[PDB]
Symmetry: C2
Subunit: 283 residues, 2 copies
């Protein structure tokens, strides 16, 4: 129940689905992954009602209706992601993607109205810069894309951030049960995943592993949306992507570069800056 252990586990599992996704490289995963979160949340909700004297649960449409929004944002986001890739090569797209770190940062302050120090603001930026540094191409063509590409890449990041920030709003706007908030959230996700398909096929063990892993990480993200903040999330995600590159060296035997070494140092420092207690920062 310690936020850092959840955050650490999210890091471990965000990089697990990273590797397990590639290992199954020679579609309806998101659908199965949603139902896994919805059915595991439902289970704990039901179990909590049967085990516990009191469970706080707002059934009023005033608040339940708002769990649509994340799904609507994520739907629009996925169209923008697809749109972007038709103007930019994947690496240009991948590196514009580190802007979600700063856009979550900004909306954290604007929408969630939480305050950050100067040292913290410098850490948010350093994280984005440190991740980008690691992804710079070890010795493609960015700076060559149409304006549409650059503008969409940016709007993609804003939607990504908005979805996460709005979810935190939903969790923290009530003193309701985590499991009941999940059940509403993941109900609309199931509905929308299904509406998309309305708008197996070699399913291996490996395939089932990523469905579980994608479900797992998603429940942790919700936990952190409730009992911790978006910035903790994006530090977990970002450290996952660094670990993925470090694990790719020992497994898929990919070329370690100086930009990986540098980006890790930047990120480790960006971690300390943001999460350091301000008495420790000052010796």
């Amino acid at each position: 129940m310690q936020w850092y252990l959840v955050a650490a586990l999210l890091t471990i599992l965000t990089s697990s689905q990273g590797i397990l996704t590639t290992l199954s490289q020679s579609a309806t995963i998101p659908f199965l992954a949603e139902l896994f979160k919805l059915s595991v949340s439902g289970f704990f909700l039901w179990k909590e009602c049967r085990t516990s004297p009191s469970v706080r649960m707002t059934k009023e449409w005033r608040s339940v209706r708002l769990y649509v929004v994340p799904s609507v944002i994520y739907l629009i986001h996925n169209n923008v992601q697809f749109a972007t890739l038709t103007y930019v090569d994947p690496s240009t797209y991948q590196i514009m993607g580190n802007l979600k770190i700063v856009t979550t940062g900004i909306l954290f302050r604007l929408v969630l109205k939480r305050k950050l120090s100067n040292i913290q603001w410098m850490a948010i930026v350093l994280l984005a810069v440190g991740t980008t540094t690691s992804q710079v191409k070890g010795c493609d063509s960015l700076f060559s894309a149409p304006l549409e590409g650059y503008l969409l890449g940016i709007l993609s990041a804003c939607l990504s951030a908005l979805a996460g920030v709005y979810t935190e709003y939903l969790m923290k706007k009530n003193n309701d049960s985590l499991y009941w908030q999940n059940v509403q959230l993941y109900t609309f996700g199931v509905i929308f995943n299904m509406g998309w398909l309305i708008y197996f096929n070699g399913y291996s063990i490996t395939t089932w592993m990523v469905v579980f892993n994608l479900g797992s990480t998603g429940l942790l993200v919700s936990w952190l949306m409730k009992y911790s903040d978006n910035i903790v999330k994006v530090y977990s995600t970002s450290m996952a992507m660094l670990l993925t590159m470090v694990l790719s060296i020992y497994l898929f035997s990919v070329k370690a570069t100086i930009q990986l070494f540098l980006g890790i140092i930047i990120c480790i420092i960006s971690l300390q800056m943001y999460f350091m207690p301000v008495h420790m920062l000052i010796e």
Copy 2:
């Protein structure tokens, strides 16, 4: 004010950068520093009633050391380049930032916060990032890496030891310069004699053989060198290496508007790292925590 000197050093360290692309001068550059220091020393003795000056060999002898280190350093620099390409050598050079950092604490026994230590590292990381070979490419023998490292330690030791000399006395800047740059002139001159000996003196008469652009860099190299001494006395090595490092960034950014050279994201990124590394080190710790 130290920051204006530091800013001027940045401006002039990038000037000699450009003017270079447009090497006996070390001798003329030292002679310029020795003769400009001598002038101010003489003028200070004629103008002020007392000028502090330690003439005792106990302390005067210690101005040899920098020259001995710099001599050894130049041999190591040359030695290194025979194992690694220019670029690998250029990027190993950012280690002087951390070695000055360490010796600042060890030799100069000065205090650095955690935030400051993180800034020293960030500066080295930020400069490296701007240099790092994008899309000529032979990083990733040990001699090379070990000598590159030893080079940085000596570089740092020379700078840190000079600061020690300036700040070990409450003597005049101009008298400290005059001792420092006397040994430099002597050694520069011994080297030029050696170099002529190496080719049997067979070229034009050594004493006789001793553009405008050429004169610009001699002055420019002299100028920056006097500023470094000022900062060794009334400022620290870390301010120096921030000035140098920002010069190397400026040089790359100025090369884009002048020589129209290849702008990369690594330049953009390294600047942001460095800007942030600047704030971290030179920010007052109450400002670092304000909203």
